[PDB]
Design a binder for this molecule. Structure first.
Ligand SMILES: [Zn+2]
Lengths: 107, 99, 59, 60, 182, 50, 175, 240, 125, 99, 55
């Protein structure tokens, strides 16, 4: 229902925009609109092998978004990449225009 | 942006009329009512925004780079097709000149 | 245009000459203005900017 | 008055070492190359799964 | 009618219960669907006049190419059909065989003129409006859809005054002056 | 010409245009036959040969 | 309280599915390039080669007096297995009683023979399909059109009667 | 390892994709609560309360059929109501995945000849009731012609040089007309003196000689060197 | 929901929109009353649609005029035109046609430029 | 480069604004001017198109959407900034529930 | 149906299938069911047999 789509609506956005989560992962080009019938499930790593794929009890979370937010290297990359996209996008638009005008005006 | 004058845009046809909506000056009740969540929710909002703009700027970089790729492939492809068509229109004249 | 000439006699000597900005906007000097001395009126291909320099290539 | 030339062109062996490495990096693009099997735990497909594409040769 | 099997479709190929050869591909139906023509016999009433124009155009092109009778009557018929609006260009005389067409006479009808003048959103809306008696050409109210509007007579296609449609377009732009009733 | 009335004029002009266009035009494109069905074109040919 | 713009209902040739031209009421497929191939090398074929013959290759062999298996062997310097598809055999039989010599030289126990499974006897279609499916075949042919098809599809060596012996082109290990 | 994925239905009916940051080929679990060969599982809570149903990751480096699925096959005939005759059910590795793709309303006949794999097959077919384990040689289908009737797809993961004869015998006995024939051909186990394309061409020719029309072949190259899946249908009259 | 009527009065570039509806009798030009319309020597040019027909026609209706454009005298001519033809249109639509054409006769006997402007000019002699 | 030297196809560097004339920042050169001029020309082209449509309005133009759509006092187009699937004013019992 | 002049042919729900340009003024129609022939006569002195299947 829409009541559950309004709870998993963020990690579906993360899976849609997989390609810009890690700068080294580089998926194959699909579109992936939200499928009509899906189900959100949790991986059971069993009690046979330890320590390799094991995410412990102290760091298991409830979405993909909390894991990506708990990752501190991804936070470094997202903040840095967002600041450089920001200062590229505000490169010559309006603060530049009015500081050029104030440069003309000051003398 | 394109600033179409008011004297022109009041005298436009019905299909060509420009939907320009005025800003809101009154603190309306739904805006003063509506709740926003804080802390973990505002950093989730910040995170989703950063992820979505990184995805959109990466896609724009990729499609601009593909545009720069395919215009020069168009250039070399048109040169090779012009050389080919020159060779065809001289081989046809050879064929008919022999026959 | 402000200062490539020192007098209206000089501009009168150079009337009709083709100038251009550094943007390659071609132009022509038309008439010396009266009260500021080396200042003149030129006409260009379109609207030049305040951050330009006009050029009279002579030899 | 020579053009700028290549350090890899100064050796005939190193040039073919580095245009074969380029070739077998391009071969991963056209085919799918058997890399050597499953390395560790099966992590997943790591690049995506397309449910619409079928890359199989149909007969006649 | 039952999607014949292979032996039946091979054994009776010319059987068709809908499309016949005398139908001419249902083009009366096709252009009366395009231009929303009420009665069944308007296509053929126009087809007689297109056949008159093309019969005269044949019999007039069969004259020698330089005599002034042929040139005068070809130019005179070309001028008359352009002024009426069936022909869209009075330049070449091959229009008198090729471009003379029931669809051209049907594009000159009153709802199609209306829809091209943006006076109604579709040809069926224009039919409904001039059936409801909103449209006058000149001073006098025109009531039937089949009315053919020549080139000089399409400058006077307006709405009647005291029309609710005229009132709502004036009040949409709030240029409604209630002194002259709209 | 300037004195030749109808069917003679149409077929005369058509014959002249065919004879002019048969040089440079293609032989599969200059003389297109009218589409006639098989069992009546063959009967047309048989009666004409008779 | 009638409706306006009333019309007579006729049939719609654009819409009505009862008539025949309106009886016309995704998964892509990009076939991968073969793992037998390097860029254009075909690194996987190895002697004993197997060579698909067609009818003009047989006719030119008999016109130039080359044996089939011995001409193949001293062309490639390898052991060859020549293959007559049933459509090439059908084409040789359809060539008539002028080509009896060619037909009963194609009837040779040293020339093995495949079994094509399709309708019609178009040997060029059959050879092109079964070679671009598998890339383990040499195509021996002298048709200009079939030679152009085969040398446009990559990794397929092409053999042809030229002069007084067979020649081979897209096989990069001949000496 | 404790992460969260989204399950999504594949193009093929009965199999699914779990999208995360690496996406997994996944099937529903017919025997929930245990793994068969140590694969990982996904437990969804689908909505009396919601029930925890679970899913199993299909490993393409340990399954030729999963390598074929995620290389991209246009049509598997293993479908959610069908009957599959698995030949060479070498353990319960791929037979479990075929079993729960086929579902509770369909049957998988798992034919194997060795006996310790047969013991593991029977202990797996306890908790998967839609598996009929048949411990018999597939080279003699008459020795178990009484236990199986009218399958819809044959899958052949045998690795013997008389493969095409085994496939033809089992198809002529138990496959129905226009049913599925999925073959996993291993070039080196058929014969190693010729190359892989020669042995694949010969095996496809053998199939059409035994009147199984091949529709499709796939090399399944990143997971297995010199393998193939050939998907055909049992035409029985008119490959033409 | 209310019976209301909108008319227009124009001179050179002034234009005045008058809304007339049923009410208590208030006549308001640009929000301010009618007794504030400057230049105060043409206030009787504004008044004469009222004094020509009596205030008992205006005792039951309220008019409001919005005047833009123009100058002083063009605005008072736009105001008087808008008021006059608005009273005529109200008595047409919501009162009887006999009072309608009595109002038209009175305004037309005073000057028909209360009701019809002189609009498109010049003459090319 | 068939008969050209690499010391001949060098890189000519471009000059900066004079430091005396520095408050008018960035002396613009021909690439900057063409970026200016073609922007001006495309905006004048769409202004000319809109002026021609205003000249050819045809005031007997009825649409059905000119019942819902309406016009402010100056004559321009009112575009409601909320919804067009919502309603701006909400009923009394809706206000009761929200409050 | 034989109308004012032309004979028309309608389908089951009443959409017009055919307007026959021959059969100029019918007053009497009758179908021949074993031969699939619509026979037409009327104010003209003409009798017209029209094959319904071929057309
Ligand atoms: Zn064949």
């Amino acid at each position: 229902d829409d009541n559950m789509r309004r709870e998993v609506q963020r990690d579906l956005l993360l899976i849609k925009h997989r390609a810009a989560l890690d700068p080294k992962r580089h998926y194959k080009k699909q579109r992936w609109e939200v499928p009509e019938r899906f189900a959100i499930g949790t991986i059971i790593e069993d009690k046979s092998e330890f320590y390799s794929s094991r995410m412990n009890r102290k760091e298991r979370k409830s979405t993909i978004l909390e894991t990506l937010m708990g990752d501190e290297a991804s936070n470094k990359y997202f903040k840095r990449k967002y600041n450089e996209i920001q200062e590229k996008s505000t490169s010559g638009r309006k603060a530049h225009y009015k500081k050029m005008k104030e440069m003309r005006k000051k003398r | 942006g394109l600033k179409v004058p008011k004297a022109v845009q009041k005298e436009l046809p019905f299909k060509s009329q420009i939907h320009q909506m005025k800003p809101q000056k009154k603190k309306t009740y739904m805006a003063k009512r509506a709740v926003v969540l804080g802390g973990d929710e505002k950093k989730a909002r910040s995170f989703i925004q950063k992820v979505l703009t990184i995805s959109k700027a990466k896609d724009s970089k990729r499609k601009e780079q593909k545009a720069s790729q395919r215009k020069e492939r168009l250039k070399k492809l048109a040169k090779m097709e012009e050389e080919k068509s020159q060779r065809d229109k001289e081989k046809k004249k050879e064929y008919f000149a022999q026959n | 245009i402000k200062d490539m000439f020192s007098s209206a006699m000089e501009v009168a000597r150079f009337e009709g000459a083709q100038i251009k900005t550094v943007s390659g906007i071609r132009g022509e000097i038309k008439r010396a203005l009266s009260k500021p001395e080396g200042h003149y009126r030129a006409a260009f291909e379109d609207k030049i900017l305040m951050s330009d320099i006009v050029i009279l290539r002579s030899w | 008055l020579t053009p700028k030339r290549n350090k890899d062109n100064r050796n005939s062996r190193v040039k073919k070492r580095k245009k074969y490495q380029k070739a077998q990096k391009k071969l991963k693009s056209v085919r799918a190359v058997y890399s050597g099997g499953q390395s560790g735990v099966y992590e997943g497909e790591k690049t995506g799964i397309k449910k619409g594409l079928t890359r199989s040769v149909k007969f006649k | 009618v039952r999607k014949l099997k292979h032996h039946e479709q091979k054994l009776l190929k010319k059987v068709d219960f809908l499309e016949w050869k005398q139908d001419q591909g249902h083009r009366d139906t096709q252009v009366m669907r395009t231009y929303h023509i009420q009665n069944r016999e308007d296509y053929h009433k126009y087809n007689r006049i297109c056949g008159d124009i093309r019969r005269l155009a044949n019999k007039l092109s069969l004259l020698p190419p330089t005599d002034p009778f042929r040139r005068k009557h070809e130019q005179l018929l070309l001028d008359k059909l352009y002024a009426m609006g069936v022909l869209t260009t009075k330049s070449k005389i091959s229009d008198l065989e090729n471009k003379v067409t029931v669809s051209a006479i049907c594009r000159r009808r009153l709802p199609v003129i209306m829809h091209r003048l943006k006076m109604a959103e579709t040809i069926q809306d224009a039919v409904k409006f001039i059936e409801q008696g909103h449209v006058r050409v000149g001073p006098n109210l025109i009531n039937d859809p089949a009315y053919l509007v020549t080139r000089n007579m399409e400058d006077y296609v307006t709405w009647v005054d005291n029309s609710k449609i005229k009132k709502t377009l004036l009040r949409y732009r709030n240029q409604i002056d209630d002194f002259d009733f709209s | 010409d300037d004195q030749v009335i109808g069917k003679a004029r149409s077929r005369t002009l058509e014959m002249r245009l065919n004879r002019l266009s048969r040089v440079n035009g293609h032989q599969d494109k200059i003389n297109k036959l009218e589409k006639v069905p098989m069992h009546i074109r063959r009967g047309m040919i048989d009666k004409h040969v008779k | 309280t009638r409706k306006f713009g009333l019309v007579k209902r006729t049939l719609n040739t654009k819409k009505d599915q009862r008539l025949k031209k309106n009886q016309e009421n995704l998964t892509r497929n990009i076939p991968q390039v073969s793992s037998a191939l390097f860029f254009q090398y075909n690194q996987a074929i190895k002697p004993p080669y197997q060579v698909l013959i067609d009818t003009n290759f047989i006719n030119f062999s008999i016109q130039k007096k080359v044996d089939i298996v011995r001409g193949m062997m001293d062309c490639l310097l390898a052991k060859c297995n020549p293959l007559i598809t049933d459509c090439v055999m059908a084409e040789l039989e359809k060539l008539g009683p002028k080509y009896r010599i060619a037909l009963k030289l194609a009837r040779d126990p040293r020339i093995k023979r495949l079994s094509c499974s399709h309708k019609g006897t178009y040997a060029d279609d059959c050879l092109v399909h079964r070679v671009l499916q598998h890339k383990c075949y040499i195509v021996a042919t002298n048709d200009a059109g079939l030679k152009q098809r085969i040398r446009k599809i990559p990794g397929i060596p092409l053999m042809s009667v030229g002069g007084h012996a067979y020649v081979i082109e897209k096989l990069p290990d001949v000496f | 390892g404790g992460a969260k994925v989204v399950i999504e239905p594949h193009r093929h009916a009965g199999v699914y994709i779990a999208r995360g940051k690496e996406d997994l080929l996944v099937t529903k679990n017919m025997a929930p609560g245990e793994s068969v060969y140590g694969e990982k599982r996904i437990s969804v809570e689908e909505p009396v309360p919601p029930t925890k149903v679970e899913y199993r990751v299909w490993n393409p480096f340990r399954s030729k059929l999963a390598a074929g699925i995620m290389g991209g096959l246009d049509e598997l005939f293993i479908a959610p109501g069908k009957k599959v005759l698995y030949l060479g059910a070498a353990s319960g590795t791929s037979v479990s995945h075929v079993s729960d793709v086929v579902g509770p309303e369909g049957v998988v006949y798992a034919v194997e000849f060795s006996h310790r794999p047969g013991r593991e097959l029977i202990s797996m077919a306890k908790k998967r009731p839609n598996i009929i384990p048949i411990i018999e040689d597939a080279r003699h289908p008459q020795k178990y012609r009484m236990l199986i009737g009218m399958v819809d797809c044959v899958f052949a993961d045998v690795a013997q040089p008389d493969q095409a004869r085994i496939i033809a015998l089992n198809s002529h006995m138990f496959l129905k007309d226009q049913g599925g024939v999925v073959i996993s051909i291993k070039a080196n186990c058929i014969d190693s003196t010729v190359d892989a394309e020669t042995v694949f061409a010969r095996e496809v020719q053998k199939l059409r000689e035994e009147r199984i029309k091949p529709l499709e072949q796939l090399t399944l190259e990143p997971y297995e060197r010199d393998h193939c899946i050939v998907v055909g249908r049992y035409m029985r009259s008119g490959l033409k | 929901a209310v019976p209301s009527v909108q008319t227009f009065g124009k001179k050179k570039s002034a234009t005045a929109v008058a809304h007339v509806k049923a009410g208590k009798g208030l006549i308001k030009v640009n929000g301010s009353p009618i007794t504030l319309v400057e230049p105060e020597i043409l206030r009787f040019k504004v008044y004469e649609p009222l004094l020509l027909v009596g205030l008992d026609k205006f005792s039951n209706i309220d008019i409001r005029v919005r005047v833009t454009g123009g100058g002083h005298v063009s605005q008072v001519y736009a105001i008087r035109q808008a008021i006059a033809k608005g009273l005529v249109a109200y008595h047409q639509k919501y009162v009887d046609e006999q009072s309608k054409n009595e109002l038209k006769k009175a305004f037309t006997s005073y000057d028909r430029t209360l009701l019809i402007a002189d609009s498109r000019r010049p003459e090319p002699k | 480069a068939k008969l050209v030297h690499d010391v001949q196809k060098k890189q000519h560097r471009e000059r900066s604004q004079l430091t005396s004339r520095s408050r008018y920042g960035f002396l613009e050169k021909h690439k900057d001017y063409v970026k200016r001029a073609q922007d001006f020309h495309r905006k004048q082209s769409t202004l000319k198109v809109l002026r021609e449509k205003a000249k050819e309005r045809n005031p007997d133009e009825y649409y059905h959407a000119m019942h819902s759509r309406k016009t402010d006092a100056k004559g321009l187009l009112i575009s409601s900034r909320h919804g067009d699937e919502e309603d701006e004013s909400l009923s009394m019992d809706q206000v009761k529930l929200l409050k | 149906v034989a109308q004012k002049k032309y004979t028309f042919i309608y389908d089951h729900e009443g959409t017009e299938l055919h307007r026959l340009k021959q059969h100029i003024e019918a007053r009497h129609l009758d179908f021949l069911p074993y031969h699939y022939l619509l026979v037409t006569a009327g104010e003209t002195g003409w009798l017209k047999y029209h094959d319904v299947s071929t057309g």
